[PDB]
Amino acid sequence: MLRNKILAAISQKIPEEQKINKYIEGLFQSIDKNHLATHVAKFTETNSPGNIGAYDILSSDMNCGYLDTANAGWKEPDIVTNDAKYKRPQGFVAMEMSDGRTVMEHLQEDSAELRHEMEELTDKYDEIRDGILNMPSMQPYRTNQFIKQVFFPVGGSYHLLSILPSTVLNYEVSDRLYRSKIPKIRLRLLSSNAASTTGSRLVSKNKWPLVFQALPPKFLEKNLAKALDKEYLLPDINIDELEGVDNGCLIDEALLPLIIDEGKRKGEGNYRPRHLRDERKEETVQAFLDKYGYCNIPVGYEVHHIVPLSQGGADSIKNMIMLSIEHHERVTEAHASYFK
Amino acid sequence: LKSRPENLSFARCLNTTEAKFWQTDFLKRHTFKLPLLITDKAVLASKGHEMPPDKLEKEIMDPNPQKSQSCTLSTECDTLRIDFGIKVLPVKESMYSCSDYNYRTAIYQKIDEYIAEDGFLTLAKRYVNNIANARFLWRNRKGAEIIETIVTIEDKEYPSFNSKSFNLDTFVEDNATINEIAQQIADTFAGKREYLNIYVTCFVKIGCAMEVYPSQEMTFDDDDKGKKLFKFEGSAGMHSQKINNALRTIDTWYPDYTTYEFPIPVENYGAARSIGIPFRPDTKSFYKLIDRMILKNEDLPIEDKHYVMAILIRGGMFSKKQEK
Amino acid sequence: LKSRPENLSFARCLNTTEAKFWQTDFLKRHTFKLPLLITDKAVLASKGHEMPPDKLEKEIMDPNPQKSQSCTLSTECDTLRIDFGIKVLPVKESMYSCSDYNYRTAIYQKIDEYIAEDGFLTLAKRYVNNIANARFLWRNRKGAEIIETIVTIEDKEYPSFNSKSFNLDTFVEDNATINEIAQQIADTFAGKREYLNIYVTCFVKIGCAMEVYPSQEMTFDDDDKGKKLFKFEGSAGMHSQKINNALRTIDTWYPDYTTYEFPIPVENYGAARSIGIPFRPDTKSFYKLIDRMILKNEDLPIEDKHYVMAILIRGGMFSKKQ
Amino acid sequence: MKGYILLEKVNIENANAFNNIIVGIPAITSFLGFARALERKLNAKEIAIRINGVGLEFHEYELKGYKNKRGQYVTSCPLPGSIPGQNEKKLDAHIMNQAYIDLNMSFLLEVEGPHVDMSTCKSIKSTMETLRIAGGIIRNYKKIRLIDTLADIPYGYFLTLRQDNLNDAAGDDMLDKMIHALQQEDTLVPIAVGFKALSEVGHVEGQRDPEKDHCFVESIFSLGGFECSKILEDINSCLWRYKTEEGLYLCTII
């Protein structure tokens, strides 16, 4: 029943026999271009001239502490051509009949019914079978860009690598993750035309794979709280323009309630542990004095932060005022009365 | 020297980070700030897109449920604040890969000759000019009352700018702050400095409860097809690619400039998405100039040298035509 | 030029913010306001929908549990206050993308000609009229005693409006305040200014502990079922794109206008949900009209120019498949 | 004079996160290559040191994209500007598979050699500004410190190798063992740890540098786990170091 499928594949206005002729004159001319591979290039970037692939065959040592292709799953080889102008053999062997298997399997064991159907439909089935059944497996000759190349420290010297992706392993992983429950990603960043231009039929039919989700624990993700923890607050009272500062010292009695208010109406609901507290440094205060014409703190004055560091404050020139000892313990006991 | 090396690559010397949006008040912009968040929404429109005259008669009166996202300032904060940073690296120490050696020596010689001749000052001045006029506001810029920009290098707070008083088609070379910032950038460009760090913060008085415009993500999904805006650490932000595209809009030496009179972003073929045509589809492209400079030695005009070095600062993969 | 470019889109020129609901008393209108919150409410229907007679006999007396939300005034305030704002930007500086230069120059020339003849004054008058008659109240306008609308520009508080006197079918252009505001709006539209910032505050007196009607969220068949209302900064409010639809009801130039005699919102095909028939399904649509205006380069009646400028003010995606 | 140097709270943006079949944490080879590049940069300068063994401490992470209402992750990509080769003049460009991630992590380097002191920390601080981590861009850092006591390590979860859990599962091929072991324990995650060999050492026409030895490789995957710093067993049993065999370039702990 492949004749009507072939007729449906052809989209011309020629007669059905002419459709069959147009279908068949391309297959035996595209047999040579189709090749067999395992790690076919152009998967990372389709803009790569030529067809580069390894076709790994060796398979042993299912006991080491690492996973690679051809030792796991690996139940279908890669049939990859050079481009999409002649992709006919992949779709030709990709059909299924009423029995329930693929055309390639029937070609391998030389099914009698398919043989007589081909003999009815044409007279060159033997050439097609000889072309397909032992198709050449090519070597990865030459390299270009669009292929990820890195340097590895082998001994004291260096080696140049030519990393290639295993698409059959990708397809197997996609199938197993489809029939599983592990967290996974879809990764649908591809189109039908691009997947066709790769040339590999395994990715042409598996356009959007399934990928392992290798992530740190859930409570290690950034959010608004973590970002706001690293931000700190400074008061709006500029001591530079304020009256009664006397080169940066709390000098008059009738300004302390304003400062206690500013430290009071700005540090509510911001108590944090020491590891989240902003650390006081000895260089910020020294920079403050040096900017404000001093080297050591004057006698009778102690440094003080208008917004406490324990309540989301910041250590800077803005959140820093010099003031007398009595005012210091007054503000300290007022804040202890409010907070703790 | 017969052709370009089989593997040559560069890296961008102007690396920007992700911008972050905060909302505040203009009179208290130096003291406090508040987070800006992105809110989901759903709309119900009518089918008004251009339809064929057959489907139109059947589904003209049909409703259209759609999904979207939006960002909007609060009702008591009328100022938008955007902070980001730039890292500057020397052009000479940025050629990551070069297969050949004579080509590498020739490239170094031409770069040194350009440094001795001009000093990377024109491009630095143009980049700082793009920073000052706040071109990075692709959409929000429009309809702004006051725009203020502040640039800090490591601890020196340079005086603020006024981006409203800056044409987007002309470039200014007479400004002390622009002069010193561009001089430091050119020093880092040439090789006199190992690296440079810049921090930029812009305040916009867009109005009270107005709408801000974060960057939009590029995602694919079978079910959802709505608009998704860029969320950066839980707050709205802008992509680093979008900011970098505004900064490298300095190209005024393309052919037929007198017919258009606007700068375009620098690219290999002079292509710009806004116009839809390549301005350098010919012998004025980067490849032809670099072939007329390195392969066949010839003193190109100063404008083409400016364009070539501007391409080099942008970075890319300028290798030979790969063959099977 | 022969056809529209493959990429063409206009950003909107009238950016309306989102309304916020407050409640107050009419005598203390300029003294205080209180928040207006939304309350959950579950309901028990008696299966009143139309059903086939097969299962009707067995499933008629069953109850029906659903959930919903509601928003009513308090027992001490009888006035509802709505605050929102508008930003006005020039029409010429609104073409977001255009993959052609000849089309851009042609559109700029046409806009310059329209500014030369009309000056964007009629549309400005109609928009301020739609602001004044409080068409944006929607279901809150029904059964109201006093509706008072105030428009504030910068620091100039314009004289108040009596919104009930205006009729929702005819446009008044003789008011001094309406013309004064429309002058600034037309100046901003043409390009004499850079931007305009209007602020609208509306007081509606509906009664004590009556019901107000905020916008309703659109929910797809994914999360749940039930009525959900829009909450803007906690308090109830209206969607920004719902207020814009009311201010867009200016189109009185469609064919068969004498048969119906009411404005409709400006749409591409002239669709009107309030009546269910399309008013521009043919050569009078925007797509047909803009082709004769730009490509064929022919003169049009000033009504079609008004409609085209109204479409351009709203904005859209006027792309073209190759 | 051996010692340990800790780089605290390094932020990396737009780091590469897409291996062949892994999305998320970048391969360990990227971190080891970053350490090797740092060592090469110093050795090209006057300060001569050597780095053997790197320990990674995760603090924060964020995949580039968003989370679906079903809990899945959808990844976003930058708009492709231009691609060399054919069709390089058209405005729109082809889209391939890619993923990105931001992460803030601390590094522990076991550095050996002469003159290991505060001057070495200053040199590493000056020279680390011109580097990239796994294709990402460094933006900010807490500080650089010289650590000899395990108690000085800040709070965070290290990443180790747990290939025993992979080898102690049922199934003939190790894909089934890996899947089953992932089903038993939710902490375990699959990570890339090196490269195999698929060809022989030789020379080809066209490469990054035509002087070294060329060899086509594959990506090697294994399992790994996260252990807290406060419950860490010992300093030496958290490091990652190179391992070279007959075409078995790999990173391990030892």
Side-chain angles (χ1 to χ4, degrees), chain A residues 1-304 306-340, chain B, chain C, chain D:
Chain A
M1 81 319 274
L2 324 173
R3 40 166 294 107
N4 36 306
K5 327 322 202 47
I6 287 155
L7 290 182
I10 309 298
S11 56
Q12 302 298 323
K13 49 137 294 179
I14 55 186
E16 327 278 355
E17 42 265 33
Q18 291 276 114
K19 289 162 175 115
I20 292 156
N21 305 132
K22 185 203 168 273
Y23 180 80
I24 193 177
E25 305 202 319
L27 254 73
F28 87 110
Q29 299 186 87
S30 63
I31 284 305
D32 51 352
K33 316 270 183 166
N34 276 63
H35 292 47
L36 204 73
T38 305
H39 308 69
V40 47
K42 310 171 77 47
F43 184 51
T44 43
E45 171 96 0
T46 39
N47 236 325
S48 148
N51 36 285
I52 302 317
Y55 189 60
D56 205 78
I57 39 178
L58 55 102
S59 42
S60 57
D61 206 19
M62 297 68 195
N63 263 327
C64 46
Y66 67 88
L67 154 73
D68 58 288
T69 200
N71 320 48
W74 174 222
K75 337 209 299 211
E76 186 149 343
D78 250 345
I79 298 105
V80 52
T81 166
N82 160 76
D83 55 7
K85 312 185 43 163
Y86 27 78
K87 268 194 94 202
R88 279 296 329 119
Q90 295 126 346
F92 174 63
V93 310
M95 339 195 186
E96 303 213 341
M97 71 285 308
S98 149
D99 165 56
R101 55 197 279 210
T102 168
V103 181
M104 142 174 183
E105 274 185 86
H106 270 340
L107 266 283
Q108 187 38 68
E109 280 196 323
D110 193 348
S111 148
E113 45 100 22
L114 177 57
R115 152 96 77 187
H116 96 267
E117 276 302 319
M118 291 284 79
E119 294 323 296
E120 286 182 276
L121 243 195
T122 186
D123 39 358
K124 288 163 299 310
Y125 159 74
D126 170 59
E127 175 258 356
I128 289 307
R129 154 187 189 84
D130 294 334
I132 292 179
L133 280 201
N134 53 347
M135 103 199 307
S137 84
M138 23 57 67
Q139 279 309 282
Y141 78 111
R142 90 149 290 151
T143 325
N144 48 5
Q145 62 179 5
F146 314 103
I147 311 189
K148 303 313 197 98
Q149 306 175 326
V150 285
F151 283 149
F152 212 93
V154 172
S157 81
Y158 283 113
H159 263 60
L160 180 149
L161 308 189
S162 176
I163 315 163
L164 295 188
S166 49
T167 88
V168 291
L169 169 63
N170 200 358
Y171 172 72
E172 172 87 354
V173 161
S174 88
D175 278 279
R176 306 287 200 97
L177 261 305
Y178 195 14
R179 291 273 78 84
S180 80
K181 295 294 293 305
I182 320 158
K184 51 209 161 309
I185 323 291
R186 189 83 159 100
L187 211 154
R188 42 186 106 222
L189 288 147
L190 253 184
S191 190
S192 79
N193 259 288
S196 149
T197 54
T198 84
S200 162
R201 85 160 174 82
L202 261 300
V203 69
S204 194
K205 104 171 173 295
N206 185 258
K207 219 173 51 184
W208 303 335
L210 268 297
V211 178
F212 288 89
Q213 184 196 276
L215 288 184
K218 198 148 311 299
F219 74 109
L220 277 192
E221 205 151 338
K222 337 174 91 159
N223 45 60
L224 192 63
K226 311 209 171 141
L228 287 186
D229 277 319
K230 292 151 199 50
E231 317 303 274
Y232 308 96
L233 326 165
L234 53 142
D236 79 296
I237 308 194
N238 197 353
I239 78 157
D240 178 270
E241 47 88 24
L242 200 45
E243 73 98 9
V245 280
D246 211 344
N247 201 261
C249 313
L250 261 183
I251 182 88
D252 62 277
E253 172 46 279
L255 269 186
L256 203 86
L258 176 58
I259 308 144
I260 305 158
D261 153 43
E262 202 40 71
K264 259 261 218 175
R265 64 150 261 260
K266 217 156 182 134
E268 50 270 43
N270 315 121
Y271 196 55
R272 32 184 97 193
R274 283 190 205 277
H275 82 267
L276 272 206
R277 242 179 291 280
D278 209 331
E279 290 321 293
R280 150 78 77 84
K281 328 196 277 276
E282 75 280 17
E283 324 97 14
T284 86
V285 50
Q286 198 41 64
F288 163 70
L289 300 132
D290 276 281
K291 151 183 156 316
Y292 217 148
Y294 275 119
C295 79
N296 45 13
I297 39 172
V299 183
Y301 294 131
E302 215 179 47
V303 83
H304 175 51
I306 302 111
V307 172
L309 312 103
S310 86
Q311 306 284 344
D315 46 312
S316 88
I317 325 290
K318 333 285 202 37
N319 189 42
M320 181 148 318
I321 186 52
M322 271 182 343
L323 50 77
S324 170
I325 306 99
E326 38 258 41
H327 288 156
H328 205 304
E329 94 268 341
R330 277 157 109 82
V331 174
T332 305
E333 69 97 39
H335 277 78
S337 91
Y338 179 47
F339 302 97
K340 196 256 163 212
Chain B
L1 283 200
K2 198 69 150 271
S3 171
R4 276 197 311 280
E6 208 83 4
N7 188 287
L8 167 65
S9 97
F10 270 90
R12 44 164 184 278
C13 317
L14 269 183
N15 308 6
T16 39
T17 84
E18 311 295 30
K20 224 183 176 149
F21 282 5
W22 314 82
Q23 38 162 344
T24 166
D25 206 301
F26 204 69
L27 278 295
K28 279 179 305 175
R29 58 186 185 273
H30 297 305
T31 294
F32 91 115
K33 73 180 110 92
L34 279 163
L36 200 50
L37 300 107
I38 302 185
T39 312
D40 213 310
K41 91 184 311 173
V43 311
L44 170 74
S46 39
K47 297 203 192 206
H49 56 275
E50 188 198 67
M51 275 164 291
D54 168 46
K55 148 192 280 293
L56 179 33
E57 325 301 319
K58 327 163 48 143
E59 36 252 47
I60 175 155
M61 292 281 183
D62 269 40
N64 216 0
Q66 301 289 349
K67 335 182 71 173
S68 275
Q69 290 190 320
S70 79
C71 205
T72 294
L73 289 190
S74 88
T75 56
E76 71 305 349
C77 306
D78 68 328
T79 309
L80 169 76
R81 164 195 171 132
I82 171 176
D83 310 354
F84 68 101
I86 326 185
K87 158 163 283 154
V88 186
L89 306 182
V91 47
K92 214 188 263 176
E93 289 94 44
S94 86
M95 179 186 2
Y96 268 28
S97 153
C98 176
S99 95
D100 211 1
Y101 196 43
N102 329 299
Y103 201 97
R104 153 187 300 268
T105 317
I107 279 284
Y108 283 154
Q109 175 219 326
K110 301 312 265 181
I111 285 174
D112 281 306
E113 195 218 24
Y114 187 89
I115 290 170
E117 169 150 26
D118 165 84
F120 279 134
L121 205 43
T122 307
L123 303 189
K125 248 168 224 207
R126 290 215 179 190
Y127 289 151
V128 181
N129 213 155
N130 253 339
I131 280 175
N133 52 55
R135 155 137 25 186
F136 42 99
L137 292 138
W138 303 68
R139 177 143 203 211
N140 288 293
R141 171 143 192 195
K142 305 175 51 57
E145 163 159 5
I146 291 165
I147 310 181
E148 176 190 36
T149 326
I150 289 109
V151 174
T152 312
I153 297 298
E154 81 283 21
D155 299 273
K156 165 74 166 33
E157 201 86 340
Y158 283 91
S160 85
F161 284 109
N162 173 252
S163 304
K164 294 207 73 39
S165 41
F166 273 96
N167 197 334
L168 283 201
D169 291 355
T170 86
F171 287 98
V172 181
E173 294 126 26
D174 319 328
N175 200 304
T177 76
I178 291 192
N179 276 347
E180 48 204 350
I181 292 177
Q183 190 45 244
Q184 286 187 269
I185 284 191
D187 273 358
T188 322
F189 268 3
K192 309 169 176 167
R193 204 173 292 229
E194 35 188 291
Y195 61 90
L196 192 47
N197 279 7
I198 312 181
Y199 306 126
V200 199
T201 285
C202 185
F203 303 111
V204 190
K205 199 150 170 277
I206 203 146
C208 207
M210 277 328 139
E211 173 185 52
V212 317
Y213 300 86
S215 211
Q216 190 170 324
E217 319 219 64
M218 168 177 196
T219 58
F220 309 93
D221 201 7
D222 38 23
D223 289 59
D224 205 315
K225 268 200 269 204
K227 146 193 290 211
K228 299 289 165 20
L229 307 179
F230 176 63
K231 300 195 46 66
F232 184 54
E233 302 171 281
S235 291
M238 207 174 314
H239 288 184
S240 47
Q241 316 91 278
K242 199 159 214 324
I243 295 189
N244 261 5
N245 198 292
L247 292 197
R248 70 158 187 273
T249 324
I250 62 172
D251 200 345
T252 54
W253 321 283
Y254 53 93
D256 300 338
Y257 173 71
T258 84
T259 324
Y260 290 78
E261 285 103 335
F262 49 86
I264 59 150
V266 52
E267 211 76 50
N268 287 12
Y269 286 76
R273 315 179 182 279
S274 49
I275 267 70
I277 214 74
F279 292 108
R280 295 151 176 274
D282 50 1
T283 75
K284 280 262 143 198
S285 44
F286 161 70
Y287 287 136
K288 300 318 208 89
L289 296 175
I290 214 76
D291 294 344
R292 257 168 62 203
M293 181 185 248
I294 306 287
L295 297 194
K296 314 197 259 153
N297 229 318
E298 155 186 340
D299 224 26
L300 295 173
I302 181 71
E303 284 82 37
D304 310 4
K305 291 210 211 127
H306 288 327
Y307 166 66
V308 157
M309 311 305 298
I311 275 278
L312 285 209
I313 301 180
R314 169 199 176 259
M317 329 189 321
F318 327 109
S319 294
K320 211 196 85 212
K321 181 165 274 168
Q322 320 284 288
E323 273 322 296
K324 15 186 185 167
Chain C
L1 43 70
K2 289 151 218 297
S3 312
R4 282 194 310 278
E6 219 149 290
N7 258 313
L8 172 59
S9 77
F10 277 87
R12 86 180 72 104
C13 320
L14 225 59
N15 276 276
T16 45
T17 84
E18 319 223 327
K20 217 182 168 212
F21 278 17
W22 312 81
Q23 52 172 327
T24 172
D25 199 271
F26 198 70
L27 283 320
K28 309 179 166 333
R29 255 185 293 113
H30 317 299
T31 287
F32 84 114
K33 62 213 185 50
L34 295 174
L36 191 49
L37 310 175
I38 301 177
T39 314
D40 255 336
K41 244 201 171 166
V43 286
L44 190 73
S46 195
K47 313 257 283 217
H49 45 281
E50 180 164 25
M51 323 145 81
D54 177 36
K55 76 187 173 141
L56 162 53
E57 307 314 291
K58 42 169 64 178
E59 300 248 87
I60 171 184
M61 214 51 96
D62 284 285
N64 230 10
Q66 293 55 30
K67 348 174 181 188
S68 97
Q69 303 186 242
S70 82
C71 186
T72 87
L73 290 180
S74 87
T75 38
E76 305 225 66
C77 323
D78 47 6
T79 316
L80 155 78
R81 164 198 196 125
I82 292 172
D83 305 271
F84 69 102
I86 314 185
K87 172 182 276 325
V88 198
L89 309 157
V91 201
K92 187 156 311 150
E93 324 182 15
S94 97
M95 207 189 309
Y96 200 80
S97 97
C98 201
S99 95
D100 179 33
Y101 211 67
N102 320 301
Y103 212 104
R104 175 174 307 255
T105 36
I107 278 193
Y108 283 13
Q109 163 194 340
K110 293 314 197 239
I111 294 173
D112 284 31
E113 293 176 1
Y114 187 89
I115 292 174
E117 333 171 354
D118 187 35
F120 281 110
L121 193 49
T122 300
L123 308 168
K125 281 162 155 194
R126 294 211 168 185
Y127 287 158
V128 182
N129 252 321
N130 261 338
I131 278 173
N133 54 8
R135 203 179 305 239
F136 56 90
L137 288 174
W138 287 94
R139 213 181 143 176
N140 304 279
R141 205 171 124 92
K142 262 160 52 181
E145 175 167 26
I146 309 296
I147 312 186
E148 159 169 37
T149 320
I150 307 111
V151 156
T152 296
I153 302 275
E154 303 296 333
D155 263 328
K156 167 68 161 23
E157 183 154 317
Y158 281 74
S160 146
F161 282 86
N162 167 235
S163 201
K164 285 203 86 37
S165 39
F166 299 88
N167 180 30
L168 288 205
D169 293 344
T170 76
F171 294 106
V172 152
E173 66 275 356
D174 322 317
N175 209 290
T177 325
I178 281 175
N179 292 345
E180 187 178 27
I181 299 165
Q183 208 35 70
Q184 315 200 254
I185 293 195
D187 286 344
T188 319
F189 268 149
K192 276 157 228 174
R193 333 169 45 123
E194 280 176 359
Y195 70 107
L196 198 44
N197 266 352
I198 322 164
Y199 288 108
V200 196
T201 289
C202 194
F203 292 107
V204 187
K205 173 160 178 230
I206 60 200
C208 205
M210 291 305 148
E211 181 181 40
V212 305
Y213 302 85
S215 272
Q216 187 173 327
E217 299 285 320
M218 151 85 77
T219 72
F220 300 85
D221 200 55
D222 282 59
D223 38 358
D224 274 277
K225 298 181 311 301
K227 168 199 253 190
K228 274 171 192 332
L229 298 199
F230 172 64
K231 332 197 299 165
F232 179 61
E233 304 187 3
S235 306
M238 217 162 302
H239 284 152
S240 71
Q241 80 261 41
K242 189 157 175 61
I243 303 172
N244 247 351
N245 192 285
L247 315 183
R248 217 203 303 155
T249 312
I250 58 135
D251 185 37
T252 61
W253 313 289
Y254 49 94
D256 321 308
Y257 169 63
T258 82
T259 317
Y260 302 100
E261 313 197 276
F262 57 57
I264 59 160
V266 191
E267 311 275 40
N268 288 33
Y269 287 133
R273 302 167 34 155
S274 70
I275 219 163
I277 75 183
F279 287 105
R280 302 164 174 279
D282 70 272
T283 69
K284 291 314 282 283
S285 45
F286 171 67
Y287 297 118
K288 290 300 214 326
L289 278 193
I290 200 65
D291 291 341
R292 303 160 67 253
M293 171 166 174
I294 296 277
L295 312 181
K296 291 198 180 38
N297 203 344
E298 84 190 73
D299 203 75
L300 260 66
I302 207 170
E303 284 75 33
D304 307 273
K305 315 293 221 315
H306 286 333
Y307 166 70
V308 157
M309 292 309 130
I311 280 278
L312 289 198
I313 281 183
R314 172 191 74 101
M317 158 176 170
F318 323 113
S319 83
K320 168 91 216 69
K321 177 64 152 289
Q322 79 100 61
Chain D
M1 51 185 318
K2 219 194 57 73
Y4 299 95
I5 281 296
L6 185 120
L7 324 158
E8 206 159 21
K9 316 294 178 123
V10 190
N11 302 14
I12 299 102
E13 57 141 334
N14 268 23
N16 188 11
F18 172 74
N19 311 121
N20 200 10
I21 49 185
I22 308 285
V23 153
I25 302 135
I28 318 304
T29 46
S30 292
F31 303 94
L32 289 200
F34 152 72
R36 183 50 163 247
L38 185 48
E39 145 196 334
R40 271 194 71 258
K41 188 153 304 309
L42 274 191
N43 284 18
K45 224 196 311 172
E46 325 80 340
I47 300 104
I49 58 148
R50 214 181 320 299
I51 296 145
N52 305 77
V54 192
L56 322 173
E57 174 175 331
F58 288 73
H59 302 260
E60 282 153 68
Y61 88 119
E62 168 189 89
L63 207 59
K64 270 306 151 54
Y66 75 99
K67 219 171 70 38
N68 206 321
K69 96 179 53 56
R70 262 78 72 80
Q72 315 136 353
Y73 266 76
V74 172
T75 80
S76 39
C77 72
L79 189 62
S82 79
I83 291 294
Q86 294 260 28
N87 295 92
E88 80 171 336
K89 331 186 60 169
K90 50 190 298 221
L91 291 175
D92 316 61
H94 70 139
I95 320 173
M96 321 315 268
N97 300 317
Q98 52 200 276
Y100 302 94
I101 184 178
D102 312 351
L103 43 81
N104 158 55
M105 54 181 21
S106 309
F107 283 84
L108 184 133
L109 301 164
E110 176 200 87
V111 57
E112 72 99 43
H115 285 202
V116 177
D117 37 358
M118 191 215 98
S119 86
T120 311
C121 326
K122 189 153 285 171
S123 171
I124 212 82
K125 182 226 81 52
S126 173
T127 196
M128 193 184 58
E129 308 263 305
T130 89
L131 280 191
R132 287 208 199 162
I133 301 182
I137 286 98
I138 306 142
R139 165 200 323 171
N140 251 315
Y141 63 56
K142 190 53 170 309
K143 60 183 59 88
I144 322 293
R145 54 171 61 250
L146 175 64
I147 288 323
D148 316 273
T149 89
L150 176 56
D152 269 284
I153 306 306
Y155 197 22
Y157 294 37
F158 280 80
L159 179 94
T160 69
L161 173 62
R162 322 287 277 273
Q163 73 293 30
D164 47 305
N165 305 64
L166 158 79
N167 260 4
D168 294 342
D172 35 3
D173 55 330
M174 61 295 278
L175 189 44
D176 300 31
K177 321 178 61 147
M178 183 184 263
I179 287 186
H180 164 207
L182 280 149
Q183 302 224 30
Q184 323 214 134
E185 184 48 53
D186 304 306
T187 290
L188 270 279
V189 288
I191 61 200
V193 285
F195 313 91
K196 217 165 91 53
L198 319 176
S199 61
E200 51 265 28
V201 160
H203 269 226
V204 279
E205 305 284 339
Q207 53 203 110
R208 195 170 170 191
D209 182 77
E211 317 282 326
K212 305 307 209 326
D213 311 309
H214 181 98
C215 196
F216 302 89
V217 316
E218 184 217 18
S219 320
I220 289 310
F221 313 92
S222 308
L223 288 202
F226 286 84
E227 293 93 328
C228 161
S229 93
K230 286 186 218 295
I231 321 157
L232 200 72
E233 179 255 323
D234 213 298
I235 281 186
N236 190 274
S237 68
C238 84
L239 260 57
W240 290 83
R241 51 188 86 237
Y242 286 94
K243 173 160 216 42
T244 306
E245 316 288 353
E246 195 34 71
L248 255 285
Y249 331 97
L250 163 154
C251 328
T252 179
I253 289 195
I254 288 178

